[PDB]
Paper text:
In the present work, we present the purification and biochemical characterization of a mJRL from the stem of [name] ([name]). Size-exclusion chromatography clearly showed that [name] is a homodimeric lectin in solution. [name] adopt the expected β-prism fold with the three characteristic Greek key four-stranded β-sheets (β1–2 + β11–12, β3–6 and β7–10) and all the connecting loops well defined in the electron density. The structure of [name] is the second structure of a mJRL reported with two carbohydrate-binding sites per monomer after BanLec.
Two structures of [name] in complex with D-mannose ([name]:Man) and methyl-α-D-mannopyranoside ([name]:MeαMan) were obtained at 2.75 Å and 1.9 Å respectively. These structures belong to the P6422 space group but with significantly different c axes (257.3 Å and 204.4 Å respectively) indicating different packing. In both cases, the asymmetric unit contains two molecules. They form the side-by-side dimer in [name]:Man and the tail-to-tail dimer in [name]:MeαMan. The overall structures of the [name]:Man and [name]:MeαMan complexes are similar to the [name] structure, with rms deviation between carbon α of the four monomers of 0.75 Å and 0.7 Å respectively. In the [name]:MeαMan complex, a methyl-α-D-mannopyranoside molecule was modeled in each of the two binding-sites 1. The interactions with [name] were all conserved except the hydrogen bond between O5 and the hydroxyl group of Ser133, which rotated 120° as a result of steric hindrance with the methyl group of this ligand. For the binding site 2, a methyl-α-D-mannopyranoside molecule was only modeled in monomer A. The hydrogen bonds between the ligands and the protein in the [name]:Man complex where conserved in the [name]:MeαMan complex, despite a slight rotation of the ligand potentially due to the close proximity of the ligand methyl and the side chain of His36. An extra density is also present in the binding site 2 of monomer B but the quality was not sufficient to properly fit the ligand. This is likely a consequence of an insufficient occupation of this site due to a steric hindrance with the methyl-α-D-mannopyranoside bound in the binding site 1 of a symmetric molecule in the crystal.
Residue numbers in the entry:
A (entry chain B), B (entry chain B), C (entry chain A), D (entry chain A): 2 to 145
């Protein structure tokens, strides 16, 4: 893994989930959300084969699918973390900004913001902590 | 440059300043600060030679020097951006967290926070926008 | 470009030809050969898009096409360089070894051998020097 | 490890020896040689600390030390492999070419040649197979 791994943003509960591969391209995100981020699932390419990571998190909220077109890639991710109900600190919102459009915000932008603008590099995968919801979130980047 | 380049955090004024090299190790930071971040200067290693980047920014505030010991490296950077006086959006504070201790916060933690926790990788250099102060800030990371 | 670039193997004549991109996957090679290597052409993926490099070299010899399957990647390249006719030093043969099978040798294995076994990494593109034939050859590798 | 790992050149006997670290700079090589390569030892830098790898191999031949100056780095390695005595295939010679001078050849340039010219990158460490002599040899490279 010649990847830079950033994270975690969020809290300490739930369970750590992570990839088992060497991603070079992010092709798809399925995110479940409502008052916070419920779940994440994403597809990546490795040696020309597509692998499905996740679903990580629960089946609450509503689903949205982001299918990146060829030539489309993320240039920034933003989000917010904070309390929800009985959970002290989880991922309340996520926004995915590509070179073509913005996806989100998903969830609700309450709590402490974070932001990852990418001047040079490619976002290729994610990891985090998960229970019924997304407790924490992190990012894998490849040099460009 | 097989480096991941993150940024910019902050505003659009001042002037872009950036490295001209291939850093593999951050050895020293000199930061000037008071109500905000006034200036940045740092030393990096390339092919076993030490290079001095900066000073970028003005000569206001007070100076603090961070000299990393062998075996010491940054595991996270935090900061805040926002208005100062007549400047709409600049870097108000920066905190540098190594595997041994925390340096800062420098400046004042007013405005919008940002945070870059590094789970795998090495911070080796910086860039930004600079006038009399630090208008904007960014980070270079190497896979570990 | 966070790629390791190896080369050149071969001579100093012909004209340098090189990629203008950030390849992350080699999908196809078209090689022209007979007594030496006449030409190279290859396709690579960047941000999910396929780009064609070449053809570099002349229209002599006979053509062979290598189409990598999903999950197939090169683990080694071998070849030979040396004199042919009026050319002091050019690429006489190339062999491409994937995790599934061996392609080649192409050309004739006369002259000085070279070999690039890859223990960890991915070969994603090539460059070289070219006239009527392949004067010289080089390889781009990505960490895996 | 965001390093490209090339190898092995040589035979299948002796015992595999390898680094346990994340090198970013090669500072020193100690090589034992005569009719073949008897042993390798090298120092590398990681997070500003110097670690010694080896000695790998036996105590035959004569010793030579290569101490790289600040700003000096390897641009190519050459060698030869082949039979010697009862050993079917081992490393007969090695030559180390820096941007300032050539070190070697060490050993005897008999057998099958190999060569690793580096157009873009840095050689930061080695591995191999070792018994009384250097059975096999490999190289770690970092993008530059
Ligand atoms: C409802 O509790 C569960 O879900 C939350 C949010 O995912 C976690 O913090 C917690 O550990 C449990 O797994
Ligand atoms: C005081 O004005 C100068 O300094 C500030 C902060 O650096 C910049 O925003 C501005 O463009 C000028 O260079
Ligand atoms: C000897 O001639 C053959 O081999 C050379 C080099 O491969 C080709 O250029 C040529 O067209 C023929 O096919
Ligand atoms: C025949 O002459 C041309 O082709 C050969 C082989 O490619 C080159 O060496 C040379 O510079 C010319 O381009
Ligand atoms: C032929 O003997 C010499 O060369 C071999 C291989 O290099 C060494 O092991 C040995 O000690 C001698 O110096
Ligand atoms: C002499 O026998 C030993 O040394 C040689 C050369 O290193 C190896 O091939 C072999 O496996 C043994 O370790």
């Amino acid at each position: 893994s010649g990847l830079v791994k950033l994270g975690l943003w969020g809290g300490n509960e739930g369970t750590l989930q992570d990839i088992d591969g060497h991603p070079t391209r992010l092709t798809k995100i399925v995110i479940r959300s409502a008052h916070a981020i419920d779940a994440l699932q994403f597809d990546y390419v490795e040696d020309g084969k597509t692998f499905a990571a996740g679903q990580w998190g629960g089946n609450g909220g509503k689903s949205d699918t982001i299918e990146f077109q060829p030539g489309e890639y993320l240039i920034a991710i933003k989000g917010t973390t904070g309390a929800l109900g009985a959970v002290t600190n989880l991922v309340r919102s996520l926004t995915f900004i590509s070179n073509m459009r913005t996806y989100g915000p998903f969830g609700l932008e309450h709590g402490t913001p974070f932001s990852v603008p990418v001047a040079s590099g490619r976002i290729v995968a994610f990891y985090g902590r998960f229970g019924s919801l997304v407790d924490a979130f992190g990012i894998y980047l490849m040099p460009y």
